[PDB]
Amino acid sequence: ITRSIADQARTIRIPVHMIETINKLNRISRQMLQEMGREPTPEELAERMLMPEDKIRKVLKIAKEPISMETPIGDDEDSHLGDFIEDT
Amino acid sequence: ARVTVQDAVEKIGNRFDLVLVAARRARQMQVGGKDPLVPEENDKTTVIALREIEEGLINNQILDVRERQEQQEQEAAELQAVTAIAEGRR
Amino acid sequence: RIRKDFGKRPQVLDVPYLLSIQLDSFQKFIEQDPEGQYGLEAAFRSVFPIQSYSGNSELQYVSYRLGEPVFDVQECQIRGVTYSAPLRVKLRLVIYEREAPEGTVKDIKEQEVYMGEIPLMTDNGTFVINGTERVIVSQLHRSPGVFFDSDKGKTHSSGKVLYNARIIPYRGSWLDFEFDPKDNLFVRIDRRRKLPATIILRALNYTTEQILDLFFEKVDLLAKLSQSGHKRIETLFTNDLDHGPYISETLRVDPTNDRLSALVEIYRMMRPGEPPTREAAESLFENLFFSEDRYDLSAVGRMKFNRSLLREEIEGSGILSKDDIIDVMKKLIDIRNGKGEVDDIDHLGNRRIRSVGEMAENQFRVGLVRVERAVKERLSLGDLDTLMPQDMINAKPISAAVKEFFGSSQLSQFMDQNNPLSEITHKRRISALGPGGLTRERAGFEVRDVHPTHYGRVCPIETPEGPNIGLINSLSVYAQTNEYGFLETPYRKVTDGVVTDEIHYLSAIEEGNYVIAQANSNLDEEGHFVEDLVTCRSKGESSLFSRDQVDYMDVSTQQVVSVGASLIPFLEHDDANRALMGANMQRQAVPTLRADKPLVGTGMERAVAVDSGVTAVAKRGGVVQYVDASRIVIKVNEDEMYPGEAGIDIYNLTKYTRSNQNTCINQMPCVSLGEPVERGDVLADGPSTDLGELALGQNMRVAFMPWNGYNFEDSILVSERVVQEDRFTTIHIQELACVSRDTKLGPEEITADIPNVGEAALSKLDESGIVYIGAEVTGGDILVGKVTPKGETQLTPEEKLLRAIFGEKASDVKDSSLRVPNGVSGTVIDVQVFTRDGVEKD
Amino acid sequence: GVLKIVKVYLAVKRRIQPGDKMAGRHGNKGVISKINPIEDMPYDENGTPVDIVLNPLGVPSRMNIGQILETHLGMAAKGIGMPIATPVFDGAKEAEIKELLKLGDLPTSGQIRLYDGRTGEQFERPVTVGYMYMLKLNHLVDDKMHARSTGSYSLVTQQPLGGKAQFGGQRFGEMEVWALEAYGAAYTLQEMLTVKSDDVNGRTKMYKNIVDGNHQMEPGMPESFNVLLKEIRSLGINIELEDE
DSSP states (O other): OTTTTTTSOSSSOOOSHHHHTTTTTTTTTTTTTTTTOSOOOTTTTTTTSSOOSSHHHHHHHHSOOOOOSSOOOSSSSSOOGGGSOOOO | OOSSSSSHHHHSSOSHHHHHHTTTTHHHHHHTOSTTOOSOTTSOOOOOBTTBOOOOOOSSOTTSOOSSOOOSSSTTTTHHHHOOOOOOOO | OOOOBOOOOOOSSOOOOTTSHHHHTGGGTSOSSSOSSSHHHHHHHHHOSOOOOSSSOOEEEOOOOOOOOSSOSTTSTTTTOOOEEEEEOOEEEOOTTTOOSSSSSSOOOOOOOEEEEEEOOOTTTOOOBTTBOOEEOOBEEEOOSBOOOOOSSOSSOOOSSSSSOOBOOSSSOOOOOOOOOSSSOOOOSSSOOOOOTTTHHHHTSOOTTTSSSSSTTSOSOOTTTTTTSOOOSOOOSTTOOOTTTOOSSOOOOOSSSSOOOGGGGTTTTSSSOOOTTOTTSSGGGSSSSTTTOSSTTSSSTTTTTTTTSSOOOSSSOOSSOOTTTHHHHHHHHHHHHSOOOOOOTTOGGGEEEOOHHHHHHHHHHHHHTTGGGTTTTTTTTOOSSSSSSTTSOOHHHHTTTTTTTSSSSTTEEOOOTTOHHHHHHHSSOOBSOOOTTTOOOSOOTTTSSOOGGGTTTBOSSOOOOSTTTTTSOOBOTTOEEOSSSSEEEEOEEEETTEEOSSOOEEOSTTTTTSOBOOTTSOBOSTTOBSOSSOOOBSSSOBOOSOSSSOOEEOSOSGGGSOSSTTSSSOSTTSOTTHHHHTTTTGGGOOOOSSOOOOSEEOSOSHHHHHHTTOSOBOSSOBOEEEEOSSEEEEOOSSSOSBTTBSOOEEEEOOOSOOOTTSOOOOOEEOOOSSSOBOTTOBSEEOTTOBTTBOOOSEEEOOBOOOOTTTSSSSEEEEESHHHHTTOOOEEOOEEEEEEOOOOSSOOOBOOSOOOOSOSHHHHHEEETTEEOSOOOOOSSOOSSOOBOOOSTTOOOTTHHHHHTTSOOOOOSSOOOOOOOOSSOOOBOOOEEEOSSOSSOOO | OOOOEEEEEEBOEEOOOTTOEEOOSSOOOEEEEEEEOSTTOOBOSSOOOOSEEOOOOOOTTTOOOOTHHHHHHHHHHHHOOOOEEOOTTOSOOHHHHHHHTTSSSSOSSSEEOOBOSSSOOBOSSOEEBOOEEEOBOOOOGGGOOOOOSOOOBOSSSOOBOOOSSSOOOOOOOGGGTHHHHTTTOOHHHHTTTTTTTSOSHHHHHHHTTTTTTOOOOOOOOOHHHHTHHHHHHTTTOOOOOOOO
C-alpha cells in the first residue's frame, strides 16, 4: 500500500524525492524554533543542505495540487475558472 | 416620424409582408454590389451631411409586387455565384 | 450677539458616553495588571487541566504572563501585521518515571513560553488586523431560558401551560414530558428515543401507588399510564402484579426479541446489548457537567429558573435521585389547574446582546482548545525527558481561530470612514443577524416591526430601508448597556402621587412587570398629581385610569430619538419616512472644503465631534511652540528648561492620507502660537466640521420656481457661478504600485539612467530611479522607470526587417514601465522606497 | 521572487460634474443635468443671480413639511444679524417666527418680486427665496459609463468576456427574448444567439464586412451546439445530423 500511493497519488505523475524533500526541511524548521525561538533564515540551512538558496525557491512552485477548473468564482452560475482564460 | 413608412402599410392589406419586401432584398443589394438595382436613382433616401447625399436605405422600391415567383433557396445561391464580392488593397 | 432661546425642559442628566459599551467590556477579558484571576483565567479553566491520559502524564496550569510585544509598534502598518502581544503560561508535565516539577533534581520545569498572541485595544477602541482596522458589532438574540410556547393540532392532550414543553439549556438535553393517551406514553430523551414512561418513574423509586393511584382521581386522561400497569376490574391483589407494582424483576412479557424489565431495560433499547456492567453509560450526562448550568455557577440561568420552577438542586442534578424531573412535572400540573405564566416571544426583556467583551471569551476558548488535538500527536513520537519544553504546544493552531474572527465573521465589518459622524453611528447599531438557532429567516411580521417596548431602548426611526427592515437598527441617546446584556434606560420613580426627581436605571425585564407613565403629563409640585386618567402603558398595552398603579415616569422626551436623528431641525414637522431617508444618506456624506455650520441647529452637533475623537485634545497645559499646517508641537513645564531635556510630545497632524473608502480625512490648525492652552482646548478642527460641530454640507440661495420642462423628474439645473468658486471639490485618491520580479531572463532594476531610445521616460525620472513630487500630464505615461530585457537580449533576423523601414534602432532593453490605467489620472501624494532594508521584512 | 517594492499614490481632485446626486437632510433627492448660464438667469431687485433653481414638482407624497421654518426664519435671522435654539418636539412657533419676520429687510411673507431675465416681464405671483441646507452625496463608481464592442473570448465556451482595460458586454438575458418573439421577428432573434456570442467563425467574417461598406452573410452553426453532439456521444448514444 506504500508502493501504489508512492507515485500514482496525484492526478498528475509526481517524482519520489520531490515529496520526500518537503518533510525533510520540516523536521528541522521547528528544531531551531524550539531552541532559539527565531525563524531559520535561508543562510544557515544553506551550509547543511545541498541546495543554494535561489533554485530552492522555484522548487516549492512545483509542489501544488494545483487547481481544478470547474470551480465557482463570483457569479456562481455560469462563471468558471477555465472560462476566463483568453485563447492565443 | 419617418418618410413614406405609414404609406407602405396602408397601400397593402398586411404588415408582416412589407417586412421581407424590404428585408431579404435590401440586404441582398449590398452583398450583390449595387448593379442589380435597375430602377432609376430617383427612388432613394436623402441624407443631409456636408452638403451632399450618401448611403441608400430602402422602403422606396416597393411598387410592383406579385404573388408566386422563386422558392427561397436560390435567393442566395445564384446571387453569390454571379458576383463574389470581396475587399482588396493597393 | 444676543441669543434668544425658547423651550428648555431642564434635564436631571446628560447624554452618557456613547463609546462606553465598547470600552469597559473589553477590559474585563484581558486582565493584565488590575484584576488577578477572573476573566482571562476562566479561559484556562476550561482547557486545563488538559489530560491526554496514556499512562502517567499530566499537564497542570498555574498562571499567565504578558511581557513585551514581538517588535516595534511603528513597523506593522507598512507590511500588514496585526499588532499584538504574546502570552506566557506555566506548564507542569510529569513522566512515567515519576518526573513532576517539585524538586531541583530529576525535576525539570519551564516557566516562560510564548506561543499564542492576541490583539489589544487602543484609545478609542478599535482592533487592527492586516493593516485594515476591524470593528466588532454586538448582535441581538433570545436569551436562553425556560419559556412557554404553543402547539398546533392535539386539541385533546396535556402538557405544561398549553402542550409540548419546550426548554432550551444550550446543548445538554431537550427534556420532553408530553402526554399521549391510548397506550404508549409519549416521552423523548435527546432526539426521539420512544419508550414506555411507565418504567421511568419506577427507576426513580415510585411504585404503582404514587403516580397512577394518587393522580388519576383528579384526571381520567391517564390512558397512557394505565396500560402497562393493567388495572382493569377490581380483582385479587397479590399474584396479579405487573410492570408497575414490582420493581426489580418486573413482568417479563413483550411481543419482540428482547424483554422489558424497568431498570435493566433502559439500555436494551439499543441493539444488540451488553451486561449491566455500565451503570453510568449515559446517566453521567445529566449531572456534573455543562449540560444543566447554562453559565458559570448559573449566573445567567438563574433568573429564568427559580422564578418559574421551584428552587434549585446543585449545578446539575445528582446520582439516582433527580430533582430536575420532579420539579418540572409539578409545573405541568400546577398551571393545568390555575396559575398564569405566559412568556412573550417578541419581548425585549427576554432578549439580550453580547458585547465585544463576551465575544472575546467564547472565541478565545475555541482557539485555545484547538491545540489539544495537536499536543497528543507529538506525544506518540516523544522520547523520554525531551518532551518537556515547547515541543508539544504549538503557536499556529492557537493563533488561527483568533485571527479568523477579527476579520472573517458576521460581526466583523469595515468602519464607515465616509463621515466622522457616521463612524460612531456604525458602532451604534445592533444587527439581528448571528446564530442560526437564535436567528432564522422565517416570516416574522410581528417581529420585523417596532414594539411599544422599544420606547427609549431602540429608535423606531433610524432603520435601514429595504428588504432588511426591522432587523438592523440603532441605539437611542439615553440608551446604555450594562455588564449583563439587556439595555438599561433611566426612569424616575414615584410612590402614590408624590414624585422623586431622582432617576432610576432599569432593564427591560421589569419594564413589562411595572407600569410607566408619560413625560408630557401634568405635574404641580412634587407631592400631588394633576390628573385622574394617567395615559400610561403596560407592556405593549396602553392602559388608562388609576394613579397609584404607576411607579415610574419618563424623565426625558429625547429618549425616543437616536443620536444621529436628533440633529435635524424640527422633528415634529417631519414624517417617519423622510426622517429615515435623511439619516441613511447623511452617513454617506463627504468632507468638503467649503464646510460651514447650518444656520439653525439643536445643540447636539458639538457632543458628536467630541466623543468621536476627531479633533485633537490636549492632556496638559502649556504654551505652543510651532503651529505648522502639518505638525504642531507643544512644550510642557515638567523638566528644567533645556534645549534637549523636556517633555517632547509631538502631535502628528495627519495630512492628505488614504482611507477605508477613498475619502478625505484632514485637520486644520485653529490655534496660534504663543497663546497658552490647557486640557479640553482644541488644537485643530476635523475634516467635515467647523469649530467642532456638524458642518457636513453648506447653504445656498434658491429661486424656487419650475424651469420650462428641463426639471421633469428629479431633474435640477445648477448655476455656473457655483462651479466658478469650486465649492464642491472632493479628493478621491487611488493607489498604484510597481513590483520587481526575479524572472528567468534576468532580474530588472529601477534607475534614472535607462538605456532607452526615447527621452519621455527621462523627463520625469531624474531623482535616481524615482520622480519628483507634484506635476501634470495625462493617462498613459510612465510613473516608475522599468528595464526588463526580453528575448534573452537576442534579436531575430525577420524582426530586423520591420524596424528597417521605420528607422533601424532596436535596443536590447526597452521601457516596460507601469502605464496609467484607463479613466482619469491624478497627482502623487507620497513615495516609498524599500531597497532591501536592514529591518525584518518578509 | 521580488527585490523591492515601490508605492505611488494617485490623488484625484474630482470636481463638480453633471451626473451625481444631491440630497440634504429632508430627502430632496435630485440630479444635475444641464448647467443654467448666467445670461438667461433672472434675479431680484438689487440684482442677485440664483445660486441654484430647485423643483416645485413633488410634495404631497413626501409629507415632510418642516423645512419652511428654516427658510423663512433663516432669511430674517440674516437681516437681524441671531442663532436659534429649538429643541426636539418643541422650539419655535408659527406665531413666534411671524413676529420675528417683521424685521429683516422689508418682506415678511417670503414672496419677493422676481424679475424675468428672458422676456423681462415680472413673474406673476412672487416666489419664495431663502437658504436651504443641502448636501452633495459621493458619486459611486458603480454607475460609471461602460461600453464594449470587441474583446477576448474563451475556448470551449467561446463567449464575450470583460478584462481590465476592456469593458464588459451586456448579457442579453432570456427576459428580453420572449418580448421579441411577441412581435414575430426573425433574423434579429437568431443573431442574439450565434455571431453575437456563441458562433465564432461567423463573428470574424462579419467584422470584415462592415469595414468595406458591405453586408454580413448568414451565421453558421453555434459552437455550443456542435460540441453537444460529442458531449452526448460519450453517453452510449449515437447522434447524427441530416439534411432534407
